[model samples]
Target chain A: NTPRILIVEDEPKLGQLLIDYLRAASYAPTLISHGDQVLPYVRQTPPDLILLDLMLPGTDGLMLCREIRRFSDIPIVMVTAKIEEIDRLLGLEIGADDYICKPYSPREVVARVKTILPLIIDEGRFQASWRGKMLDLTPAEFRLLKTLSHEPGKVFSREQLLNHLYDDYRVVTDRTIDSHIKNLRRKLESLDAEQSFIRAVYGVGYRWEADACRIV
Target chain B: NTPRILIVEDEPKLGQLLIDYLRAASYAPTLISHGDQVLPYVRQTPPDLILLDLMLPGTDGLMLCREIRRFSDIPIVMVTAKIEEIDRLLGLEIGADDYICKPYSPREVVARVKTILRSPLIIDEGRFQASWRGKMLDLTPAEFRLLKTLSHEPGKVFSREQLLNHLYDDYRVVTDRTIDSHIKNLRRKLESLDAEQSFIRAVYGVGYRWEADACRIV
Candidate 1:
């Protein structure tokens, strides 16, 4: 099955950009533009991952993150604008699994998802059977989902995922990850799974939510 | 983001002690005790960086450092069990970024890590060339001596007969092929890594010459 993703972003252009990029990167992604809608979406189908923008409409990202942590361990990769050490340190303290500054490489984010998801999806797939939502996947799909799921919040690059593919395949291009993602998302959407869990980083790769903290 | 790091140390007590201290210091550390599996894992998901120990089963940490320098510039902080070998010239020739003697304090490791984490940007100051690339591979102790002798007069050919004579002054009964073999191994190592192998040009019948002009950036 294709991995589902939820994107919690407020900006219209950036949100669409993330969706298109995710479709191209090989992970299933869905877009959510505000902090208030996060958990409700998670409750519906629980995405395979999420990308949480720090600056959002109405409720702030931190509060939404705090609320999500009360119940879930979904990975959350935070996007920020500040480069100061203090800002980064604060982001880590606020339940963010990984921090990426803005004006960044969308490609790097894809690589991170490739690394993190494989680990999580492998562990989660069997366990999901007990939850009555088991997802059986091929070795490649398993690897792709596990790579993004493992790190939850870290960013990865194109070269980085190519490295992860290791013996699986060499010379994998950006187009390869995209095709797999399109198929994966289409599959998950057919299941009516909460597709919003996987998020497109736009110009980068993809990320999973560390938590589903949404303020109603 | 706080960079994630992996520590490959064999001693369980030391490993636990380091992980606890780093966690308290707010670092997330993954600990591994084996050797053969590390490089494969690194190639797969290159960590934010690596912290390596010099002595291990099956492989020496120095060799690992050299192997890693083959394709990466990831900052390597080597922990050595031998204090006497800390500042020795041979170890430095292996391209170690820095070494910490066995008796170092846990606190000292953290502090040293902070200091060493300074980005390894390449900018050469006079006499100090940050040449980690395979080209101009500043060789081992024996090769260094041989190359230094040849470098004195570029384009001057030293026959296997003459080279064997030079090598024997320090040691006894050196084989003609030992000279040829070491040079072959050195050249092969550099070439396979895609680094320049121009310095050790071969001579079919005569011998070899150190082509300094082809070897460096001046």
Candidate 2:
């Protein structure tokens, strides 16, 4: 899956330029002009990086960035004309990994975006980027999904999966593992409505599909 | 790209100097001292850093430096005997970020090389160099490491934690799906190379391994 970026810029010119640049770099970019929409958009569909403009119409970019930092650690690159106030943004605890100055080259913005994308990760966001879809998953479900998919075509007994599900090694019934798989299957199937991400192995627990081309 | 180090030392004795040193230090260094060949080599498979000799046979060292800087920000560490004119080179904006004086200690050169390659996310180019008889599949650094680890001992199942350990150095909180994504990406690459030439296989109830008795083992 290409790293997804959310472009939060009020100026249509800058926003379009970013979208074009990011897409050319093999990234998935979505543009949102209003500052008020940034938070809601992120909360709903998280991105690997946020290209944020400091001044916006609905809300201030600095305040919006601050609000995002409260719950999410997604990398935010402040796009600002207020070069004088960059240190101020940092002083005020605006959490941003890096920034692109105004009157900057589009290539520099792409370069910065490229530099930050690999270092960013969000625990709450779990999606098969290749599939172009998101899997709404709980922690337990994600853990289960990851464990099974680690070695697709490998079947795990409920006991083995339980070991993977609980890091503290808390004892739980086998039914607990089954419920997590059920939730994962429902979410995965909802995306394709055809192929199951994990399949039951009868007496064995479950396994992820093996053939990569078949996933297509 | 692996943490590729291109050693551009022309002297056979000193060219051998950095190769053995850098390899022992666990870096992938290739010797190409002829300044004329520097740009062509880089255009093919760019290295993370270039160890350029200021005095070379083919191209003017400073001219080559300017030409490389035109397209690449790839770090160049100049190695030269011109300690007397170091100030002049600096004024001319000789593109090398760091410099090593003549009669330099091998350890000092290795140390400086290590410092520049600090965040290298790739590994061993010689061992993991692409091959065709074995079905040369293009892979990302993570994917190549994954394939190499699995193939080292075919049929040995490796858990997710073990896979993560080989791919990353610093211990950080990462999810299992991240591992799955990598595995999927590797499989996708292998699939493109040869449909019948897959290597990794999932072991039920355990982890992943090189498919037993499959393609010719590396």
Candidate 3:
């Protein structure tokens, strides 16, 4: 599936332009008009990229952008028509990756989105190729796999693995690492279940098998 | 030395504002009022980055942008006041990495420049020691040379011949198989550090590639 883009614009004409252009550009775009609806919708169904209108009816895009940053690092491109709005939006540090002003071309919007998609979206997550098949892994699973695969055939202790799992240092049971490894193995299993890519070392931690299988 | 910034803005007030703020931001910003003067100055003393105004006095910013792109990939951030100008700038693909509309905070401009600068510096340098998640790989001298050669441009496959040149200097004839032996030892070291997963990849009949995201130079 193509990357999903959430278009949070209040103007029907502009929204329609982006929707049509984005679709033509081979993106899955979903439009939301009101500011209030933005957060709820995003929470339920997170999109690959967000095209947020700075000035919305219910809530301003800045606050929404700040809120989104709290939970997700999804790429947000702010669209504003006002001059002061642009200054305040950037000066306030709302955490939007990029911004576009009104009277914009659909092509420019698409180009900007295309430029940002690769920057923000983890290509490793979407393009996880195992045995010529792109494996669909969760965020946790992706990070776990990336960390392991980064050092093929390397053994990582539970503590080291947990450190990669969390952004902050925290105390947690080793079972946390076990559960995630189990999930990562299950995902890898879907591709080549018969042969294990990740192996446990009895009492020791775990290691990734570089020559586990022929990875195309 | 601080980064040299070429500020091409026709607006006196905005250009001066950027000059002051950019100086405060620890960047060396030179203000050029006329677009025509941009090329001469850039040719004389190349800037680390260019903050280009879309509408300039002597020449249109787009033309100036196109001209600059022909010569250098130096990061360009286009500044514009009109919405249509921005649309045209991006739509035309004038080779600007980022563009900011007018009435933007000087702080925002500085922030964006800093962000853009960080990317190229990461990509366009010699990285010997690569680290991830605070775990450092204390690579051997040979291995460090190998990693630096491979990771300088991530995801790029280097042939054995190319790898040989980087490893050995003039008149030292060596078999390509020796490169593989080095790769093996390098992989062992990377694995020992728990950092080899996708750091290096065997292209079967070819050579190797480093994952751009996985290996960050410390």
Candidate 4:
């Protein structure tokens, strides 16, 4: 996704300048001229980062920053014309991620945005990848890999693996674990045939061999 | 980052109750009284999870749920006063992550929110363990402290001197290179598990910063 940037500046010229520079850098940017519109805009469509102006028509940047931090954790860079205001904003712990003085280069703003927005091992999304390539895994297979690889080298018995495989505590044969492991192994092996990431012990369960797998 | 929960209840009393309970649970909760405002609010400031009410003045919860699912996959829990609404919501597949009937305990809403919003990285201070996507990282004391400090404030660059101070409680003279070595080892461990993102970054003429975009400790 192209990182979205919200430039909350009352000065139309400066706002346009930031928008142009940010867009040139391959970012999707939207500008808000009035301070009152910022919070609602942020709440509706969250941007990847925000370039907020200290002085605005409706609300001051410091108050806006505090308001946004209550709900969202998006990075906010305070842009102010008055140098004296920096001390107060920084001292109050209003929670601006970073700050910049005005009459600055638009390129500097873009650089700051770049510093904040480099993109995850998102467990919330249930996403797992090998060497940057996403592994197409079923829910059961994902759970199996997550369980085994969590404590690498610890051999988990079928009973333990089965316990993790299904949260409902369904009655299933031990062969189910083997079946899922077999399929999971096939999927992982397709990514790298040379290394066996999962190893099965005779008369036991399986273990994730960290050294055998190549992540990079 | 604290998980944000959007409560779309029109009733002032019920909405206030949820806001109070969710905030007590350490979640940032916002209340929208109007049905029409729900969609726009959700679109602008996307919460970690949404508690959508079925009946509303501007729009119904079912429509709002469908509209939200069109753009985002953030969890949505449908809260309806009518028990009969559950079947239609479930049958329509309007993309509600869960459902809670009316006359429900406020604590139950908190429980549902907890169930849906699971954080990725967890740093157990007492246990001295850090797990990313459920995989533990083997870190030394120094490395662990460094990771914890840098990650505590992502994007804030920490100078080598500041890092040394955080790493050691007792005064000890150590070279800046020692800090670099610790950061290298920490990054190597994180990279082995996650290939997609770089956790630590070294700013030229500055110091190291934990990239917030990649790591979210909750």
**What TM-score, over all chains together, does every model reach?**
0.27, 0.25, 0.37, 0.27
Local distance difference test scores for all models: 0.56, 0.63, 0.65, 0.68
Which residues of candidate 3, in runs, are more than 4 Å off?
A1-4, A11-13, A25-27, A36-50, A55-58, A65-216, B1-12, B28-52, B56-218
Clashing pairs in 3: A149-B197, A149-B198, A150-B196, A150-B197, A150-B198, A151-B196, A151-B197, A152-B196, A152-B197
Residue B175 C-alpha lDDT in model 2: 29
Taking the candidates one at a time, how many backbone clashes does each contain?
A: 46, 3, 9, 10
Candidate 3 lDDT over B1-218, as tens digits, reads 99989888767877788888899999999988764677878778999888876662323665777687767767777665531212322232212222222323566678778887762112212543455445565544456567667766778899978887886762222222367777777677666656435567888778788754533444
Tens-place lDDT digits, model 1, residues B1-218: 57667787878878887777666766777788857888887788776657777663334765776676667666666554311111222232211211112223565566666665551112132432323242334444345445545655668888877876776774422232467776675556445545553656778778987664322322
Model 2 TM-score (2 dp)? 0.25
Show what share of the native A-B interface contacts model 3 retains: 0.00
Model 2, B1-218: lDDT tens digits are: 35878887667887886788788888898998665788888888888888777563333765676677668778877654421111222232211211112223565577777776661012245565444345455554566667667766677889977988886762222223466777777777666665676557766458888762423333
lDDT head-to-head 1 vs 2, winner: 2
What C-alpha lDDT, on a 0 to 100 scale, does residue A150 get in candidate 3? 67
Which pairs of residues collide in model 4? A42-B44, A42-B45, A43-B44, A43-B45, A44-B43, A44-B44, A44-B45, A45-B43, A45-B44, A46-B44
Model 1 in CAPRI terms: which quality? incorrect
Every candidate's fraction of true contacts kept comes to 0.00, 0.00, 0.00, 0.00
Candidate whose TM-score is highest = 3
Q: Which stretches of candidate 2 lie over 4 Å from their true place?
A: A81-102, A118-216, B1-218
Q: List runs of model 4 lying over 4 Å from the truth.
A: A81-103, A118-195, A198-216, B1-218
Ten-residue stretch with the least lDDT total in model 3 chain A: A92-101
